[PDB]
Ligand binder design. Structure first.
Ligand SMILES: Cc1cn([C@H]2C[C@H](OP(=O)(O)O)[C@@H](COP(=O)(O)O)O2)c(=O)[nH]c1=O
Ligand SMILES: [Ca+2]
Length: 129
């Protein structure tokens, strides 16, 4: 897979962010994770975590997987990087997202993220507390 440039338009919630990609505004849904909705436990902490990570970044990148690049709602499906660090993985490692929505052929980073979730669980962080 390949990282491509994007710039932040606006933080949305833990697992969605509005980015400009190839010069066009798009909402991106992070592959392979699920954060709690803003009204559920840890939803505001997940939203705040992502917001900080993308707002503080000097460089945002998006990396598509092998399969579908847009979902049924027109959201881009990608792994999102903030100064080289994957947001999807960071949320999982902190117990602020669960590995989820693992669809065959868009699942390159599945084992990297399950490894993070196992560590978050062992430490009883957040969702796993
Ligand atoms: C993360 C991801 C979500 N989706 C769809 C599945 C769910 O459909 P439903 O809307 O019918 O529940 C929805 C979950 O996204 P959200 O967790 O943002 O609500 O987005 C995909 O189709 N592909 C994916 O890779
Ligand atoms: Ca969600």
């Amino acid at each position: 897979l390949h990282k491509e440039p994007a710039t932040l338009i606006k933080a949305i919630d833990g697992d969605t962010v509005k980015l400009m990609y190839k010069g066009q505004p798009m909402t991106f849904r992070e592959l392979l994770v699920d954060t709690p909705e803003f009204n559920e436990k840890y939803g505001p902490e997940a939203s705040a975590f992502t917001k900080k990570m993308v707002e503080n970044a000097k460089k945002i990148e998006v990396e598509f997987d092998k399969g579908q690049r847009t979902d049924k709602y027109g959201r881009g499906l990608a792994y999102i990087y903030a100064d080289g660090k994957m947001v999807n993985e960071a949320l999982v490692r902190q117990g602020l997202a669960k590995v989820a929505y693992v669809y065959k052929g868009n699942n390159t980073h599945e084992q990297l993220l399950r490894k993070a979730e196992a560590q978050a669980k062992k430490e009883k962080l957040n969702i796993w507390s």
